[PDB]
Symmetry: C6
Subunit: 66 residues, 6 copies
């Protein structure tokens, strides 16, 4: 299930800069390189691996249709 995948794929495909806010309030920025049901790979200087269980919200930097 089911909503996640089209939303994240749209961001990934359009290479939209996003802000990922973590469960501790820390903000990550970059482009979604790929994802599965457990992690998101977020690209800027290096690819970092973000655990979805530690994500609170994914905020596109501009409107993106899914």
């Amino acid at each position: 299930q089911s909503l996640q995948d089209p939303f994240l794929n749209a961001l990934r495909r359009e290479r939209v800069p996003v802000s990922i806010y973590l469960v501790n309030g820390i903000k990550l920025q970059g482009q979604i390189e790929s994802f599965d049901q457990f992690v998101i790979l977020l690209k800027n200087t290096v690819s970092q691996m973000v655990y979805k269980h530690a994500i609170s919200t994914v905020v596109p930097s501009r409107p993106v249709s899914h």
Copy 2:
């Protein structure tokens, strides 16, 4: 199960502004655009994807029947 879906659907359908409070105390605001069992899409300038595991409470801005 079972309580969530009528509650969130009522908010979504009536387009009631809500406050979503996260597990770190951060408050999000907007209208519920859609949801499944893992995320809520919360609309204002952009659609942001909120993970339910990081939500503590959903507070309608006015009384809504479910």
Copy 3:
């Protein structure tokens, strides 16, 4: 399972004011309107939906038998 349901039902039925403390230390107050295994609906001016995964403790404002 098994302890939750009689405890929360007693509060709900007796309409006992409770304090719900969240995993971030934030205190909610109101009466338990209904619940399932994922959320509690907590009533005051509006019904708010509290996720049990974000609850640390439910504290009745007075002794209640279960």
Copy 4:
């Protein structure tokens, strides 16, 4: 499984005052009245229901064998 139950039962049966520390650092005190795999009922003036997912450590006020 398997370690929890003898440990908590020993506390419950011996009516040992405990400190329950939550995942946010908040300390609860009282005696364990009962428990299942999801919650602990902690007694002082009222019985409060503590969610095990929000517990970090259970600390007996004195040595207890299990």
Copy 5:
């Protein structure tokens, strides 16, 4: 699975003092008395029961082979 058990058993058997850091940054110290897949029993003046879901990292006070 699979890595945990040899690591924690090595600490337990060698009675190595460890620091257990919790998800809120609080540090516990003592020796691992026993464990299962849900909790660790950590010994100093009393045995305290630590929930693994609230543990971030287990740090031996000296190098231990597993």
Copy 6:
């Protein structure tokens, strides 16, 4: 699943220094010695065992292909 394993294996095999940020904002550093689906063993002076449920992001100190 599926993304984690090639990413972490690449770090492990190349012995890339990483920063592991925990869900409370605390940063760990060292090299990934091994991992399974529940923990990562992170090496510096001692091997410490990090629970993946307490990890927010794994950040390689330099670009690594997976």
